[PDB]
Amino acid sequence: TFKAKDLIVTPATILKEKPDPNNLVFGTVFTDHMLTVEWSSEFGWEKPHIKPLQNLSLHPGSSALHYAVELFEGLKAFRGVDNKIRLFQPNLNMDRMYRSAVRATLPVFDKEELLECIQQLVKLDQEWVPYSTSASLYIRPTFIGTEPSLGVKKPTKALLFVLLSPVGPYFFNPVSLWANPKYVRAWKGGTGDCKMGGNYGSSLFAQCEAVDNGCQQVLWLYGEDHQITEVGTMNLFLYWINEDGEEELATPPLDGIILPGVTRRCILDLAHQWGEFKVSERYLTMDDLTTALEGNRVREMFGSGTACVVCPVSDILYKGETIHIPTMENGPKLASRILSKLTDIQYGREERDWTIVL
Amino acid sequence: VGTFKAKDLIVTPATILKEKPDPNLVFGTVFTDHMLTVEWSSEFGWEKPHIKPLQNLSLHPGSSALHYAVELFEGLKAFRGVDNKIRLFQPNLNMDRMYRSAVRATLPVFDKEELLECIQQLVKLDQEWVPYSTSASLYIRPTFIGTEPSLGVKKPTKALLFVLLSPVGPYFFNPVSLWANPKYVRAWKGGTGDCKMGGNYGSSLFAQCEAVDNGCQQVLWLYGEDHQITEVGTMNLFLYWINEDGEEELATPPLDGIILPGVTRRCILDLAHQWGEFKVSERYLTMDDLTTALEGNRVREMFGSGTACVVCPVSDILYKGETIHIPTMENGPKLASRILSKLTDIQYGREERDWTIVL
Ligand SMILES: *Cc1c(COP(=O)(O)O)cnc(C)c1O
Ligand SMILES: *Cc1c(COP(=O)(O)O)cnc(C)c1O
Ligand SMILES: NCC1(CC(=O)O)CCCCC1
Ligand SMILES: NCC1(CC(=O)O)CCCCC1
Ligand SMILES: [Mg+2]
Numbered sequence: 001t002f003k004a005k006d007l008i009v010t011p012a013t014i015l016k017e018k019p020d021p022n023n024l025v026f027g028t029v030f031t032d033h034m035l036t037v038e039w040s041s042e043f044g045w046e047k048p049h050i051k052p053l054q055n056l057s058l059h060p061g062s063s064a065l066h067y068a069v070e071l072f073e074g075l076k077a078f079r080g081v082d083n084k085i086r087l088f089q090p091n092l093n094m095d096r097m098y099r100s101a102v103r104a105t106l107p108v109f110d111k112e113e114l115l116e117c118i119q120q121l122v123k124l125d126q127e128w129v130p131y132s133t134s135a136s137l138y139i140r141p142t143f144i145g146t147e148p149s150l151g152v153k154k155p156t157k158a159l160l161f162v163l164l165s166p167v168g169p170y171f172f173n174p175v176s177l178w179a180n181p182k183y184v185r186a187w188k189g190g191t192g193d194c195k196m197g198g199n200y201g202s203s204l205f206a207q208c209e210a211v212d213n214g215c216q217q218v219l220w221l222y223g224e225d226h227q228i229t230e231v232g233t234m235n236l237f238l239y240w241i242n243e244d245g246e247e248e249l250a251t252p253p254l255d256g257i258i259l260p261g262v263t264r265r266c267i268l269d270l271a272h273q274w275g276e277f278k279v280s281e282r283y284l285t286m287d288d289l290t291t292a293l294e295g296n297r298v299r300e301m302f303g304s305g306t307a308c309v310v311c312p313v314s315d316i317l318y319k320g321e322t323i324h325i326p327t328m329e330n331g332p333k334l335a336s337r338i339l340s341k342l343t344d345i346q347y348g349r350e351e352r353d354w355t356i357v358l
Numbered sequence: 359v360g361t362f363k364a365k366d367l368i369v370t371p372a373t374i375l376k377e378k379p380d381p382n383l384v385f386g387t388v389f390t391d392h393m394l395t396v397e398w399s400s401e402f403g404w405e406k407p408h409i410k411p412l413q414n415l416s417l418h419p420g421s422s423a424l425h426y427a428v429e430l431f432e433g434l435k436a437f438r439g440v441d442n443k444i445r446l447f448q449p450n451l452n453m454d455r456m457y458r459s460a461v462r463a464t465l466p467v468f469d470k471e472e473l474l475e476c477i478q479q480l481v482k483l484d485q486e487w488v489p490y491s492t493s494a495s496l497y498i499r500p501t502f503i504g505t506e507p508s509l510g511v512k513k514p515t516k517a518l519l520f521v522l523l524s525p526v527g528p529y530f531f532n533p534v535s536l537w538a539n540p541k542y543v544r545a546w547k548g549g550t551g552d553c554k555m556g557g558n559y560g561s562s563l564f565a566q567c568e569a570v571d572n573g574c575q576q577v578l579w580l581y582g583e584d585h586q587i588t589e590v591g592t593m594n595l596f597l598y599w600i601n602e603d604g605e606e607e608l609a610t611p612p613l614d615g616i617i618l619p620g621v622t623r624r625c626i627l628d629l630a631h632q633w634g635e636f637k638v639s640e641r642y643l644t645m646d647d648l649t650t651a652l653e654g655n656r657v658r659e660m661f662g663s664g665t666a667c668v669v670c671p672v673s674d675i676l677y678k679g680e681t682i683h684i685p686t687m688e689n690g691p692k693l694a695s696r697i698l699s700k701l702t703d704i705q706y707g708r709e710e711r712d713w714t715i716v717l
Contacts, residue, residue: 025508025510026508026509026510027420027508027509027510028507028508028509028510030419030420034419053419054419055416055417055418055419056416056418056419056424057414057415057416058414058415058417059414059415060393060412060413060414060415060501061386061389061522062415063560064423064424065415065423065424065429065501065503065556066429066431066499066501066556066559067559067560067563068427068429068556068557068558068559068560068561069560069563070424070425070427070560072425103564104560104561104563105563105564138509140425140509142419142424142425144424145560149384149385149386149387150385150386150387150497150499150522150524151385151386151387151529152559152562152563152566153563153566154563154566154567161419163419163420163509165509170510181548182548183548183549184546184547184548187543187546187549188543189540189541189542189543190543190546190561191561196427196560196561197424197425197427197556197557197560198427198558198559198560198561199427199557200425200426200427200511200557201426201427201428201429201463201555201556201557202427202549202550202555202557202558204428204463204464204511204512204513205462205463207464207511207512208464208513233511
């Protein structure tokens with residue numbers, strides 16, 4: 001494994017102008033520096049670099065281009081209202097990226113060395129961490145196989161790098177979802193519980209089909225009973241009165257077709273902590289939903305993820321009809337409370353072991 | 359909404375040419391002198407195609423092919439006939455599959471004829487690499503990748519199409535042993551298993567490793583509660599046997615969405631249908647159908663088909679801690695061998711047929 005202590009820094013000689021915080025398109029503007037660490041089965045890991053944001057030089061046969069031997073992560077840096085820059089649950093991302101690496105047969109690395117390197121990269125480009133309480137700096141760790149051979153096997157050459165991109169919003173701005181059981185995002189025995197590239201390229205066709213049909217995201221359905229799994233590539237939360245008549249906040253269980261979002265776990269933690277309603281990790285089907293709506297039992301439906309934190313849902317185009325979800329006419333009370341809590345913690349307006357300082 | 363044209367090819371010869379390897383090669387290990395590349399932007403469409411010296415790709419770190427596997431590929435070969443004339447085999451099908459793939463990936467469409475000609479031109483240039491052997495060929499790897507310099511999961515506004523050339527011999531007869539663990543699923547109804555998109559492959563290296571660890575060379579992909587057998591590693595699966603009706607039969611899974619329509623598969627089905635010596639059935643095959651058959655002496659052969667092996671005999675399957683031997687080798691294998699001879703006779707010009715295009 002590589003070590004932060006060996007970092008080699010090559011500052012850009014011409015720094016870019018920081019963008020306008022009020023209107024940023026997600027992941028389109030990049031900072032001045034990036035992190036890069038090369039690996040080869042022959043000599044192991046080389047020393048990590050922090051150099052000007054540049055194009056990668058890859059052999060046209062790199063397995064990442066042919067067999068999707070790749071995985072990524074998503075985490076943010078926030079400038080606290082006390083002007084101190086913080087990271088949110090960073091070690092959980094390191095753990096997920098590590099487990100995905102193993103399932104991808106990519107080379108392992110010392111989680112703490114990566115986190116420290118990332119902190120240094122952020123520290124160097126710190127002025128990119130927006131001066132806004134509604135904006136942040138997206139951190140994108142990426143791991144690709146660069147095996148020059150076309151043979152399908154464990155890579156003997158790989159690259160690990162990190163990009164920094166100042167972001168505002170990913171897309172309250174409620175969204176409509178397009179539900180069509182003809183497409184499946186992930187399946188049992190699959191790799192859907194990992195952030196491996198191969199899980200997203202296969203979804204673009206359905207995404208496109210949603211856009212030209214009036215929606216902004218796909219509602220992923222699975223199985224014979226049409227379980228509702230995720231809002232686009234965000235975890236799904238349903239706030240309602242369940243079949244037993246008790247107020248409840250529900251989300252699909254981690255049975256292998258659901259990605260264990262950090263946001264997801266935090267909302268469950270805050271929900272369990274408030275103890276004001278039942279919190280269940282259970283299955284939810286379209287019929288559980290439509291049945292519930294015609295009984296006026298649904299209050300809010302939203303998605304969770306690092307980019308949005310939470311993103312309310314107001315409609316679902318299903319069997320040829322549009323099903324309205326009373327999310328926005330109900331506040332959304334909980335959606336807001338949640339977003340309010342999480343950001344309060346991210347920007348240090350509240351102390352809690354979920355953030356890391358500079 | 360357009361295409362690039364072979365008539366616009368800008369050729370740039372390498373000044374320093376590499377020495378060809380020994381025709382007797384590690385699959386996809388050695389590459390030729392030149393490559394083909396074609397840039398695409400949603401703003402101006404397809405650029406003009408180039409044939410330049412092999413070289414790295416200069417990609418933006420945010421390229422969508424590295425983050426969301428916005429990619430797809432193909433695999434075909436050129437053969438030097440026993441008449442020294444170089445031949446391509448069923449190219450038009452590869453172009454059709456790549457096309458259908460691009461669309462399923464939301465990558466930009468192109469004129470299949472133009473691409474094919476552009477490929478003939480690339481090979482034509484590097485024809486001396488086409489092995490002077492009868493058991494070796496040149497692997498043609500067309501590749502289509504998204505170069506969207508943005509982290510947003512969306513239809514790419516930038517793409518890159520290229521083609522690599524790699525002289526090769528074999529992939530690994532030489533029977534293989536299969537690892538059958540139902541905990542790993544290659545494809546699912548509603549997914550992209552029936553296209554050659556990179557996302558279907560990265561996710562299997564773990565199972566492959568688990569395979570070797572257990573003395574096996576490939577993974578037998580199982581699907582559904584009834585453990586249907588779908589593909590042998592990344593090759594289509596054929597089972598020559600006496601079915602439940604006592605009839606001689608050549609069976610192979612149907613294209614119901616989780617099997618990739620291989621060119622070698624197509625051919626083997628056409629040959630089988632043509633000879634009309636036994637029943638040819640595209641149907642569901644399960645481990646239980648296989649076990650029941652084996653413990654009844656009803657199995658003749660099992661083998662995978664693909665461009666790299668053409669045909670690959672299966673002799674064993676590790677299932678539920680038990681090793682199940684397949685008598686494929688103790689039966690010639692007559693069918694497997696017959697197929698190999700036939701396809702090879704045709705590819706190397708020994709047999710004349712429409713399945714090839716000379717250059
Ligand atoms: C990244 C991701 C999420 C959200 O996880 P967070 O760690 O909370 O960002 C949800 N679903 C999918 C499919 C994802 O890729
Ligand atoms: C490419 C491929 C095949 C074989 O197709 P051929 O065109 O015969 O080489 C079989 N199965 C999978 C999963 C493939 O990707
Ligand atoms: N829905 C978005 C992300 C997750 C998130 O932050 O919600 C995953 C795909 C790559 C961009 C990020
Ligand atoms: N089994 C192999 C291939 C197909 C083939 O030619 O059999 C697909 C994966 C990438 C290498 C080629
Ligand atoms: Mg250590």
